[PDB]
Design a protein around this ligand. Structure first.
Ligand code: K3M
Ligand code: CL
Ligand code: MG
Ligand code: MG
Ligand code: MG
Ligand code: MG
Lengths: 194, 194
């Protein structure tokens, strides 16, 4: 029933733009919405990837590998899955493995790749693939992992046990001013609920 | 180590604004970022998202989701019930209210997250994730009455919690919909648990 009638550019930066979206509502009336988009999306099936990195080691509980970084939009530090935008011509899987290595040092193995999922669909058109990757932490390549951060990238790695993820995130949030990402929290809550 | 120095307004709509954030990188070098913010925040967070656990005896437990046209996305999305927190409303109260408006169901609060970020590389948007159980055997949830506000047109989709990820993948394959990243993350963790 509903569809886009027009998309008017309001303001365009280097990385983000704002649009006035006109669409048809299901009564058959014309309405508008204010829409955010990135300027960087070419033929990628999504803007970015987020990586769910399951660190697996003999005689260890499985860990979920997370990253903590300063996020200028938030004005502070956030804890997130490793993530980055997909380069032009790059597959979501390659992007995931690459970002995981750049941000954490680990070399993962693909497990699964989601369809493109929406980040905040009432506000933006931004999408990611969620890429599950296992990390064989007994491999020598993954012994002493060092991030290879790009220019202006400054990332801390936090590995937390899957079997206590929600409580461990709560204990990090109780100790310092930081925000947990909604996808991480959702993942941690389902682990509890399961 | 890192912090915001200044925020320059680039463009302000009714609902959303774009800013250029200047911040101090950890090397001592000043950098800029293009940031999105809502103009509606007063509150602990911008919004709530509700994880509604529909419990009916002799039935599988279901997660209650909503399908709506999202103008920024140009199409239909499958999401947790959700909306912005009214000025002077608690996140819990927003959760039960939005759940009723969007689904007709009357639930009970199970737990409430701290404010968590939606897309912190792009925006300052935050929500509380509120877990709510719904006694589907109670008379008030027999014929749930969804009360759409002006310009909301919401379909309710209840999926079994135990097969959530496969059921969502199926909707994406058949119905050309976009699943929300938080919903997808929750679904992944249900499978990844134990
Ligand atoms: C309730 C509401 C309605 C429209 C918008 C919009 N972005 O145009 C919003 F962010 C919130
Ligand atoms: Cl529950
Ligand atoms: Mg990143
Ligand atoms: Mg990166
Ligand atoms: Mg809503
Ligand atoms: Mg609503």
């Amino acid at each position: 029933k509903q569809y886009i009638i027009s998309e008017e550019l309001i303001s365009e930066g280097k990385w983000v733009k704002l649009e006035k979206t006109t669409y048809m509502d299901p009564t058959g009336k014309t309405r508008t919405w204010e829409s955010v988009k990135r300027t960087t999306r070419k033929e990628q099936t999504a803007d970015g990837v987020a990586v769910i990195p399951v660190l697996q080691r003999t005689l260890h509980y499985e860990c979920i590998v997370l990253v903590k970084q300063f996020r200028p939009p938030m004005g502070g530090y956030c804890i997130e899955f490793p993530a980055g935008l997909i380069d032009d011509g790059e597959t979501p899987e390659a992007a995931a493995l690459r970002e995981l290595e750049e941000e954490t040092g680990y070399k993962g193995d693909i497990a699964e790749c989601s369809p493109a999922v929406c980040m905040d669909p009432g506000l933006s058109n931004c999408t990611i693939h969620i890429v599950t990757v296992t990390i064989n932490g007994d491999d020598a390549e993954n012994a002493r992992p060092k991030p290879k951060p790009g220019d202006g990238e400054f990332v801390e790695v936090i590995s937390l046990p899957k079997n206590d993820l929600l409580q461990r995130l709560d204990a990090l949030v109780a100790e310092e001013h930081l925000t947990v990402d909604a996808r991480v929290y959702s993942y941690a809550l389902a682990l509890k609920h399961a």
